[PDB]
């Protein structure tokens, strides 16, 4: 199937620079305009930049002109965004999307039909910090969880039992603590009769700090 | 830049009922007869946006029969013939006539359902955490409706203020409930001073309290 896979997100100082990447598969990459859209925390979608299939034309939102530069490597089926002179307003999840067929004499529009998984850019003067992962240990129903405490920047992902456990999982929005670090909890409800027989492990990933921790909750 | 505006911004709907979300553009989106450059997108909690409708009325691959787009020029409507629980999320219109592409503010589809009292669980700080000098006490409110619930922390029956934070999930795609966790942050020193830790959950005039003794 058609997929877009993004990377390159992380923390940079105000005034700093970062490059995002978006690798496409399952379509003839060079035939299509490619587009970046972002979403600031708790805000809506905002268009950032587009580039035609051939790289013949580029387009930018007024607030990013000059500072941001879109590019593509057709031979690697990859779209890039060079983000210079970073500002607080640039803190967002960045999505790439497949845009119009641009090889034809008249471009053909199919919507932004395929989107990447997103990558998070944080512009802040602080340092990266990896989380500690603490168990939340144990009616016929038991609740257990993990507390992912004191990390920066966003985000953290959590799965259970390497993705096998999906039913009854609640992963809460991160809270910004007064310390300026985030905390997140993830819980699951399970049969209390199962606690002796089956193991429950939370799988925590914080890509910015290269922290990938699995915590068995006894 | 073309300004896109949506109505409403919040849309509470009962499953099985129709829904209509409206989008207005500041300029005509009709490029030529039959071609209005207006799209609709859905974004579910913790997911990327996904295309629903393109060019005003074209339904994207794999989108249910239930979704349709209509309108022309400056006025557009996304319609859901019968709303399902899993339709919860944000809906955005976007114009693709000109760069910059511009989006409406987003409309949050909310599902109406019967009241449900939370299942409440309290978690002492882990021994692992207490090694560090901080204590987090966690209260979980599981699978409740509506969203409005008051959490009060009590330590040796003293009402806490200013030392707790909470966050809430978006509506569950199957059962349309919310879950909430509240975290009480104490110094380890303060935690070790006191015995009884209680989370009190209030809906209307009904309060449920879950507690543990540290000792």
Numbering used by the authors:
A (entry chain A): 1 to 138, 145 to 224
B (entry chain B): 1 to 215
Sentences from the paper on this structure:
By engineering a small secondary structural element from the rabbit light chain constant domain into the human kappa light chain, we dramatically improved the crystallization of human Fabs and Fab:antigen complexes. Alignment of a human Fab structure onto a rabbit Fab showed that the longer FG loop present in human Kappa constant domains forms a bent and bulging conformation that would interfere with a beta sheet packing interaction. In the case of the FG loop, this consisted in replacing the septamer human sequence HQGLSSP (positions 198 to 204 according to Kabat numbering) between the structurally homologous T and V (position 197 and 205 respectively, according to Kabat numbering), with the pentamer rabbit sequence QGTTS (positions 199 to 203 according to Kabat numbering). The resulting mutant is shorter by two residues, with deletions of histidine at position 198 and proline at position 205, and is referred to here as ΔQGTTSΔ (positions 198 to 204 according to Kabat numbering).
